[PDB]
Amino acid sequence: SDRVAQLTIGNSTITTQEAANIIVGYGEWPSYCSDSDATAVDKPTRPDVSVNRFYTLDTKLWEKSSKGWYWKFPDVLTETGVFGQNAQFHYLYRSGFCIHVQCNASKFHQGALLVAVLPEYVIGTVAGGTGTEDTHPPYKQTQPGADGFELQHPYVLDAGIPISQLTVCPHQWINLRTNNCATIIVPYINALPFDSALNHCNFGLLVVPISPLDYDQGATPVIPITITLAPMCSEFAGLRQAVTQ
């Protein structure tokens, strides 16, 4: 009665029989932009069900040596379904998200992933190793798209900050002996009421194994982690031709 759950939105329904409750980031639900916070004057389009549904974008394989991955929002969806289309024809976009990371195993496997949401996840480089070179991450590393991107130095989140303190961000854990998924709901986070779904990534999703995957020889070794997400309260404005970047 808390281990079992069902998420239905749009024409998509998700189930789980081993849940660990739901986190509502920063203790707040996605809402539409108010007439007093708003600044742009054009009447927005709120496509509803065609874009506020569950998109299942990726699957990574968890290995005894995996480092961890991250995806950027809304970058992951800008080229998918009706949502991607609206994000392209419009300058302005705002929305919330319901994230559902899935990973099941067996009662004989073990391991724990940390699933967190980090607003304004700015990536850094190793500065030529020595730290004397002012290098910067390439577009494909900052907006990895749907395939996400593997962390090079998980301990400092590839940004000079301790992953040990990452729990200060909305999160959940997928500890195999306990659950098989994390569900986090995120409201719009920005200093503006609207923004470009192309130039700016409001937050990054991180999935990092903190307690390594393990099992005896003979148990299924292919342990996938799948990413499913649904935009919520999607609003768009500033219409023109489609643009991909």
């Binding site: 299942t56 699957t59 394989l61 099941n104 195993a105 067996s106 009662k107 098989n180 292919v222 996938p224």
Partner: protein
């Protein structure tokens, strides 16, 4: 609910019971395809095994929503998550998940 012969391939007398169920097994993690079939209830195919499809044959037209319930018969220690999708008219057989 009556049994839908999704696995309508075996035809030799001794294997007919096999059409009553289809399998699943450990995979390679590429979101592989497990099975497919047309939702058309009064059309030749899996639905002919169901009483619904049968009664359907005595009428020219029909209207309504349908439901298919899948029961997993693996051991209690087996886990898994599947994605089952209904693709409305116009959309061809999904090439990938």
């Amino acid at each position: 609910e009556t049994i839908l012969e999704v696995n309508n391939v075996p035809t030799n007398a001794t294997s007919l019971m096999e059409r009553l169920r289809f399998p699943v097994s450990a995979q390679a993690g590429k979101g592989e395809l497990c099975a497919v079939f047309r939702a058309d209830p009064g059309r030749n195919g899996p639905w002919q095994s169901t009483l619904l499809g049968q009664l359907c044959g005595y009428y020219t037209q029909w209207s309504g929503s349908l439901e298919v319930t899948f029961m997993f018969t693996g051991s209690f220690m087996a886990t898994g998550k599947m994605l089952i999708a209904y693709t409305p008219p116009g959309g061809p057989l999904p090439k990938d998940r």
